[PDB]
Design a protein around this ligand. Structure first.
Ligand SMILES: Nc1nc2c(c(=O)[nH]1)N=C(CNc1ccc(C(=O)O)cc1)CN2
Ligand SMILES: Nc1nc2c(c(=O)[nH]1)N=C(CNc1ccc(C(=O)O)cc1)CN2
Ligand SMILES: [Cl-]
Ligand SMILES: [Cl-]
Lengths: 281, 280
């Protein structure tokens, strides 16, 4: 406060964060026209980016075969490109990264932090945005591991610092990179996730210009929320998800990744109005 | 971490380790529909219930005394056994008198105990008292056009005078909370959002040096519609949650809301964040 996240080069777009941006989650997982209507609705509700995922990229989910992931993701990229809204791709598979970038996606959002063999090579060229997330696990297994940290905030920051360095060593400009602490990925459901949310600014390492890498935060409908509201199921977590998104932007998040776009946008309109009033004092 | 000063509140001593949620119980048509609503809001996590028999809002037509009493008193009598603080949203001294005699715990007055006879009605006993700021003329009960130097300072100075008037009549400072009165004589965005941004500065000091605890009510109000493209009241729930969270972040003791479950859930997240912060 009154913090300004560093800019993100994001394929066709140069994102700046005078206000935090809302990334609407477009799960392309049961048809195509169903997903396109969803995307149009989310844009109408105020989504600033769309995150296209052909898999369940969460802990304990079945891993989708390559041909099918390609068949879900690529035609949505092609159909949504004309809308001139950033298209993020939720994938850790280098082949999906290559095909999706060739199809004209703007951002690669990777739960494995570009650790899968060949992912860095897939993304090093061009201008796409890249979100390196923290997940505790061994990449070869494709499985999230058990929580284990000294200070989870420090460990998450150092890992993200190493991932940004690895991207930069391969020629990726620092301005194309954002980071994400990976809420719900190898974290104690309450203690680790809320430590990371309370200390969000400190999860982000510094770019060479001294500015912190901008932060993407995704908590929407997650177990960390169910755990504090008496165990209600995902569809009953909207108000809690709005609360978490607001907390993240209060703590300097550049982008919030959400299911409930209208509700998040409305909440962020109120947040911006408060900030605008505070700036006159 | 801010800890709002405690509120002596009739049968209850309220302390604010966490902010409390006051559920709005609009008792306007019946006297039984209101009761199931109250039970639901308690089940959803309401810490207080605000019983209102009128429209205590700018431009709203008034309800005659005997009708307001017919709506409020049976509800006080019916809800007392539930053992949750009962607040009465009234500016009428006769309703204040009758509600306290029926056993209400808190009097919530949009006129800041300015109506003739109000202070005299609430002097005695241990009821909590919420003195709200509204810019207007008590005699005609008309809200005024916004007019402030620094609205934050003007609101605080008014609330200091109302607290002092209550104390001059023998009211213990511990019984008093204050409310900047969002949407009552305020520029819809300029003034309301200044007050929310500078919320802790709207409360004057008690004699012990702690600020009077703050009640804030923004649920579904125009200030919210104004910033979300002019959506109507029933479509302001997400914006109302954001406002409540902002208010507690800025030290509010009680938030007054229509959407109890949604607000309680948001505050559960907020509490979890604070608890994590306190371990660092
Ligand atoms: N950059 C980025 N990408 C994602 C994220 C995320 O948080 N950040 N979350 C995702 C959803 N995965 C889940 C993880 C945990 C939970 C849960 O805790 O319930 C649910 C879903 C997938 N893709
Ligand atoms: N202590 C306290 N009591 C109240 C309050 C309130 O904000 N604080 N609001 C009330 C509802 N009045 C409205 C005022 C403004 C608006 C609006 O701006 O839309 C709507 C309703 C009545 N009772
Ligand atoms: Cl835990
Ligand atoms: Cl205005």
């Amino acid at each position: 406060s009154t913090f300004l996240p560093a800019p993100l080069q994001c394929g066709r777009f140069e994102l700046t964060f005078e206000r935090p941006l809302v990334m609407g989650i477009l799960n392309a997982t049961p048809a195509r026209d169903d997903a396109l209507r969803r995307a149009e609705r989310m844009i109408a509700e105020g989504a600033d980016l769309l995150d296209i995922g052909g898999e369940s990229t969460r802990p304990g989910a079945p891993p989708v075969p390559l041909d099918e992931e390609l068949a879900r993701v690529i035609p949505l990229v092609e159909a949504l490109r004309p809308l001139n809204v950033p298209l993020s791709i939720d994938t850790y598979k280098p082949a999906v990264m290559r095909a999706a970038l060739a199809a004209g996606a703007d951002l690669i959002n990777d739960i494995w932090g570009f650790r899968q063999p060949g992912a860095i090579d897939a993304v090093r060229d061009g201008n796409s945005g890249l979100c390196a997330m923290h997940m505790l696990g061994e990449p070869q297994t494709m499985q999230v591991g058990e929580p284990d940290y000294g200070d989870v905030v420090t460990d998450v920051r150092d890992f993200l610092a190493a991932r940004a360095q690895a991207l930069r060593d391969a020629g990726v400009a620092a301005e194309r990179i954002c980071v994400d602490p990976g809420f719900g990925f190898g974290k104690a459901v309450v203690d680790d996730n809320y430590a990371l949310l309370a200390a969000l600014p400190d999860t982000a390492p510094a770019r060479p210009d001294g500015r912190a890498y901008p932060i993407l935060a995704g908590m929407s409908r997650k177990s960390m929320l169910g755990a504090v509201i008496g165990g209600k199921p995902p569809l009953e977590r909207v108000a809690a998800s709005v609360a978490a998104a607001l907390c993240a932007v209060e703590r300097g998040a550049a982008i919030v990744r959400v299911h409930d776009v209208a509700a998040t946008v409305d909440a962020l309109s109120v947040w911006n109005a408060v900030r605008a009033a505070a700036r006159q004092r």
